């Protein structure tokens, strides 16, 4: 996160850290949607252009964390993956279309003050909140500036942007399975996700029932926090059917 700030304790109890066994390093952000399922971006797991093709035994899931590098004893929990599911029509070749993947934990994790799941949007919620000008929240342990790393979890609030503006800001073919967010050049304020934030959740709080909902997944961007450029997130609701499809039968 660039131009953000330190999250407060228990602010994002669903935030997940995708950690690599060897070498031990941060791999990506993710989110807890139930006691046995983790949602993240597909490119965190598969991405041929960089020879990236991880398996269930290559990673570990770290939940309930605040600090980026410390093993927060008695607070965080580590889980092993039992299976991974990449969306079958994930287009890593062109524009990272349908950048999404589900991860099945070997065993359920017990919730606590620091470990709680976020809600998945339904049509009504998505329809009512997914509007330009409405702000969302992105969290991550990624880089603080375009390339170093933050000591603690970073948070930033960003406004959703009109499709047209998003489209005219890049040469990348935009699809309906993605949306973009960030401040415009004149708006004065700034901020963005960056390397290392991948797979992180973009969430919004409902004014109707006060629950937090995850509307997106940090997918891609061109540089970090450059004027005239915006971050792109996977449109979670649009892939809601595949999500239920999987979980349901597995």
């Amino acid at each position: 996160i660039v131009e953000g700030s330190d999250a407060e304790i228990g602010m994002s109890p669903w935030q997940v850290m995708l950690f690599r066994k060897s070498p031990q390093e941060l791999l990506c952000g993710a989110s807890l949607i139930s006691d046995r399922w983790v949602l993240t971006a597909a490119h965190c797991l598969l991405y041929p252009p960089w020879d990236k093709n991880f398996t269930e035994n290559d990673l570990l899931v770290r939940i309930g964390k605040h600090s980026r590098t410390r093993y927060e004893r008695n607070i965080e929990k580590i889980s092993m993956l039992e299976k991974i599911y990449i969306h079958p029509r994930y287009n890593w070749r062109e524009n990272l279309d349908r950048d999404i993947a589900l991860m099945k934990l070997k065993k359920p994790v017990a919730f606590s003050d620091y470990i709680h799941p976020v809600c998945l949007p339904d049509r009504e919620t998505a329809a009512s909140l997914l509007q330009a000008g409405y702000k969302g929240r992105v969290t991550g342990w990624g880089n603080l500036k375009e390339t170093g790393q933050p000591s603690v979890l970073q948070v930033v609030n960003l406004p959703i942007v009109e499709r047209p503006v998003c489209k005219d800001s890049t040469r990348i073919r935009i699809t309906d399975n993605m949306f973009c967010a960030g401040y415009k050049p004149d708006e004065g304020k700034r901020g963005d996700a960056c390397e290392g934030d991948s797979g992180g959740p973009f969430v919004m709080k409902s004014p109707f029932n006060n629950r937090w909902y995850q509307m997106g997944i940090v997918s891609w961007g061109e540089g970090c926090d450059r004027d005239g450029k915006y971050g792109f997130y996977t449109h979670v609701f649009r892939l809601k059917k595949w999500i239920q499809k999987v979980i349901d039968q597995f």
């Binding site: 031990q24 570990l60 590098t69 093993y71 580590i78």
Partner: peptide, 10 residues
């Protein structure tokens, strides 16, 4: 990063 308990590395 601070080392993780081997018990999970299995």
């Amino acid at each position: 990063y601070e080392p993780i308990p081997e018990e999970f590395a299995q």
